[PDB]
C-alpha cells in the first residue's frame, strides 16, 4: 500500500477537491474514443448473443452502451490523472527535502571519461 494512508486522504472519495486544479481530459481524448469503441463492441456482442441483426437492431441500446462507457471512462481518466499528478508532486517534494539522499553529480565529458573498447572481429 504505497499511497493508501497518505495524510489528508478522505475515505471513499473518488475525486477530492484538490483535483479540481488539474486540466480535465478533452472530450476528443483517444482514451475516451477507445472507451466509446468498447461500448460499441459491447452493443454489437449483445446483438449477436440475442440473435438480433448485429449492426441494425437496437440503435438506442447501442447509443446507451456508448454513452455509459464514455461517461465512466471520462471520470476514470480524471481520477487517473489526479493520482499520477499526486505521485509526481510527492516525489518532487521528497527529492527537494532530501538533498543528501539525492545529490547532484558533477558531469564529466566524454573527452574525460575513459571507456574500454571491445573490437568486433
Amino acid at each position: 500500500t504505497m499511497m493508501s494512508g497518505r495524510p489528508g486522504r478522505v475515505p471513499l472519495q473518488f475525486l477530492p477537491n484538490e483535483a479540481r486544479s488539474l486540466p480535465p481530459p478533452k472530450l476528443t481524448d483517444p482514451r475516451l474514443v477507445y472507451m466509446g469503441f468498447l461500448g460499441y463492441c459491447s452493443g454489437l456482442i449483445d446483438n449477436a448473443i440475442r440473435r438480433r441483426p448485429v449492426v441494425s437492431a437496437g440503435l438506442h441500446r447501442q447509443l446507451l452502451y456508448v454513452t455509459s462507457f464514455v461517461f465512466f471512462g471520462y471520470y476514470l481518466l480524471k481520477r487517473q490523472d489526479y493520482m499520477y499528478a499526486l505521485r509526481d508532486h510527492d516525489m518532487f517534494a521528497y527529492v527537494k527535502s532530501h538533498p543528501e539522499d539525492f545529490p547532484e553529480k558533477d558531469k564529466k565529458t566524454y573527452g574525460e571519461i575513459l571507456e574500454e573498447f571491445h573490437p568486433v572481429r
Partner: protein, 174 residues
C-alpha cells in the same frame, strides 16, 4: 571535360603517335572509321545539339547542401542526449565523406593501372602509396567498430590507441 575537376581526377597528358604507313595497301580501319563517323557520329551529334538547345530554354539550378560544424562527442557531457545526437550525426556524415574519399582514391588507382597497362608495376607506384596511406588511416579510424558503431565507440578506440602510443613512447624513452 569540365564535368569533373582535373585536380581531383588527374589524367596524364595523352601522347598519340602519328601514323607512318609503310605500304600502299589501303587502311580498312581508316575506311571503317570514316564510315562510322559519317553514319553514327553526325546523327548523334545533331540529336544532342537539338536536345541541348531544348535544355537551354528551361535552365534551372540545384545547390549543394552545406552543414555547419557542431560540438563533437569529446565536448558532449555524459548522457546529454541532445549534444550526443548532434555529435553522432556529425560523426556519421564525416564517416560517409571518408568512405567517398577512399572510393575516389581507389578509382584513381584502377584508372592508373588500366592506363599504364603493361608497365603498371613501376608507373603506378605513386598512386599505390597514396592508397596505402589512405587505407591505413581509414583502418585505424574505423577498423573494428562493429555493426553498431558510434562516435562513442570510435572515441574509446582512439583513447585506447593514444594510451598505447603513450606507453610505447614512455618505454622507448626509459
Amino acid at each position: 571535360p569540365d564535368s569533373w575537376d582535373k585536380d581531383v581526377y588527374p589524367e596524364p597528358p595523352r601522347r598519340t603517335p602519328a601514323p607512318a604507313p609503310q605500304t600502299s595497301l589501303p587502311n580498312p580501319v581508316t575506311y571503317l572509321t570514316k564510315i562510322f563517323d559519317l553514319l553514327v557520329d553526325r546523327p548523334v551529334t545533331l540529336a544532342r545539339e537539338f536536345i541541348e538547345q531544348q535544355h537551354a530554354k528551361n535552365r534551372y539550378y540545384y545547390y549543394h547542401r552545406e552543414f555547419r560544424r557542431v560540438p563533437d562527442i569529446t565536448e558532449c557531457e555524459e548522457k546529454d542526449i541532445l549534444c550526443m545526437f548532434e555529435a553522432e550525426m556529425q560523426w556519421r556524415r564525416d564517416y560517409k565523406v571518408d568512405q567517398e574519399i577512399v572510393n575516389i582514391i581507389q578509382e584513381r588507382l584502377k584508372a592508373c593501372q588500366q592506363r599504364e597497362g603493361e608497365s603498371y608495376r613501376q608507373n603506378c607506384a605513386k598512386e599505390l602509396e597514396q592508397f596505402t596511406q589512405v587505407s591505413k588511416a581509414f583502418q585505424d579510424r574505423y577498423s573494428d567498430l562493429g555493426a553498431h558503431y558510434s562516435a562513442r565507440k570510435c572515441l574509446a578506440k582512439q583513447k585506447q590507441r593514444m594510451l598505447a602510443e603513450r606507453k610505447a613512447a614512455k618505454e622507448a624513452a626509459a
